[PDB]
Design a protein around this ligand. Structure first.
Ligand SMILES: COC1=NN=C2N=CC(NC(=O)c3c(F)ccc(NS(=O)(=O)c4ccccc4)c3F)C=C21
Length: 260
């Protein structure tokens, strides 16, 4: 049962992940794995207990569209080990290497992400940071959402979140908004507000609902039913946003209505 990986079994290697909440290495433990080391310079119980409580959340997930949790380490450092996704993150495809997907593919990526999110929500889990960098595209066909719950993602924040108004702005619908931005990513191929170069103004405007994604860049072959759904997920008033079962429904419908 329990998923604690004993010292020295894992083998950390080439480095990739930077930043806070930890560093990510490609490693080996029963095959290629990813290892994220929280690098919190040795807790500090019960931080050691706050960590275990997050691993409790991960282990509630078992779905092809949710990144596979394989286990966690406490021995050398605190660390979380997942399947190693072969391929690139969605952010990398769209914005770094400018991969051009068939609209059919684009809808399917959208469908899958919605699928995995519906699931996370079904199991009462709020991502709190959906965005293309966290949607890994494995063997270049399957979606793997990872990376759970304030600078690298203001583009995906719903207004209620941006204008840090109360304790918990985070909600299924705050996710649905982030979903709505990655929909804009898929369909426009761009990031939102590319023409405003001052990040503070963005934060200010988006929070007051003066600013919002210019939906008139959805590339021509974007189904109107998609463009409409995109706009529905982006509603400035969070209560007007669909939840994922319905989002999924609309995507599945406009999907089967397409190839002919
Ligand atoms: C270039 O970077 C990469 N190329 N291939 C990769 N394959 C896996 C990668 N894993 C990760 O980035 C990674 C991790 F190592 C531990 C935890 C979480 N998320 S978490 O802790 O939020 C979590 C979410 C869902 C299920 C379990 C844990 C991660 F997202 C990174 C890759």
């Amino acid at each position: 049962d329990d998923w604690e990986i004993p010292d020295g079994q894992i083998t950390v290697g080439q480095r990739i992940g930077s930043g806070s909440f930890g560093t990510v290495y490609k490693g080996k433990w029963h095959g290629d794995v990813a290892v994220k080391m929280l690098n919190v310079t040795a807790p500090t119980p019960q931080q050691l207990q706050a960590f275990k409580n997050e691993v409790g959340v991960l282990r509630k997930t078992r779905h092809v569209n949710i990144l596979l949790f394989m286990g966690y380490s406490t021995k050398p450092q605190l660390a979380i080990v997942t399947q190693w996704c072969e391929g690139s993150s969605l952010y990398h495809h769209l914005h770094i290497i400018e991969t051009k997907f068939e609209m059919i593919k684009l809808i399917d990526i959208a469908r899958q992400t919605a699928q995995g999110m519906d699931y996370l929500h079904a199991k009462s889990i709020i991502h709190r940071d959906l965005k293309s960098n966290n949607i890994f595209l494995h063997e270049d066909l399957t979606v793997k959402i990872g990376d759970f719950g304030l600078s690298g993602s203001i583009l995906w924040m719903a207004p209620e979140v941006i204008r840090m108004q109360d304790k918990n702005p985070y909600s299924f619908q705050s996710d649905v908004y982030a979903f709505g931005i990655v929909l804009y990513e898929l369909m426009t191929g761009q990031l939102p507000y590319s023409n405003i170069n001052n990040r503070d103004q963005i934060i200010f405007m988006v929070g007051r609902g003066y600013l919002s994604p210019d939906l008139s860049k959805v590339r021509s072959n974007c189904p109107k039913a998609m463009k409409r759904l995109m706009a529905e997920c982006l509603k400035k008033k969070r209560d007007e946003r669909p939840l994922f079962p319905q989002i999924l429904a609309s995507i599945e419908l406009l999907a089967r209505s397409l190839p002919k």
